[PDB]
Structure 1
Amino acid sequence: RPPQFTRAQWFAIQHISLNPPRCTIAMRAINNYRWRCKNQNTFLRTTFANVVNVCGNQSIRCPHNRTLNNCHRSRFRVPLLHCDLINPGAQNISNCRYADRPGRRFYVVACDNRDPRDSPRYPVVPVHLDTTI
């Protein structure tokens, strides 16, 4: 991750967007902080506070990290936009192109204690998007 962000701030930048534009546009906001195009990314059409409250759901195994059990699944399906990189040979970020796949799915996040740079308003925060279902 970019060192200027905590895990939660970088989670919010990648994964929280209520009304994202098309993927090729929406992804520039993320890739501008990277040296290379992110291969896949899901935008959850929700708010950070909403995801923080999902961190309070019962602790479950993370489907994409099966040695971890600090994951939390949403009780409802939420609208999302998934973006897949069409040109993974891209050598820089200037011309990343993405395919769009809108959907409505449950999401699963890993949550952990906040970083000291994070707002004291949320002592526990999402730090990774594990999967959607």
Structure 2
Amino acid sequence: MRPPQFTRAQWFAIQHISLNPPRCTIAMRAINNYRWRCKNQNTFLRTTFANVVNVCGNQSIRCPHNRTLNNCHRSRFRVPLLHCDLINPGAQNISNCRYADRPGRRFYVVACDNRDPRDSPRYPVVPVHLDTTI
């Protein structure tokens, strides 16, 4: 559940955008803070927010993981990325969660939508969800 004080675009950037991510165990702290249980797996795209907004501007495709949505956008470039895999699943206290870091490199598919009133007016269409990476 997205914390109320963050728009869909900001929550998206907090969870998935980071050029130079710290260790997963550290990076994930701020995200799990708003969760009941630790996130099983999370992917950071090593790019900039500005660059994802561009993806938003191109050809539209049905969302792979939810074909009813026709506002998905695949990147044309494969982007380096960092996967954070939860080590202690359904086990270790959801307070001291540890993660394994895993490099990767692929195309990403994001779902884009109109900005929220509180978002920077600089971008009318913002990325709101990471659908998948291929």
CA separation in 2, counterparts of 1:47 and 1:17?
7
Q: Cα deviation per residue 1:84-127 (whole Å; 9 max; x = unaligned)? A: 21222257542111122211100000000011111111110000
Q: Which deviates the most, 80-89 or 29-38?
A: 29-38
CA contact (8 A) 1:70 1:110 kept: yes
- Identity over aligned pairs, percent: 100
Aligned length: 133
The alpha-carbon deviation at position 35 of structure 1 amounts to 3.0
Runs ≥4 residues deviating over 4 A: none
CA contact (8 A) 1:71 1:109 kept: yes
Q: Which deviates the most, 96-105 or 73-82?
A: 96-105
SS at match of 1:51: helix
CA contact (8 A) 1:78 1:105 kept: yes
RMSD: 1.3
User: How high is the TM-score relative to the length of structure 2?
Assistant: 0.93
CA contact (8 A) 1:36 1:91 kept: no
Aligned equivalent of 2:70: 69
Q: Which deviates the most, 78-87 or 89-98?
A: 89-98
Aligned equivalent of 1:28: 29
User: Unaligned 5+ residue runs, structure 2?
Assistant: none
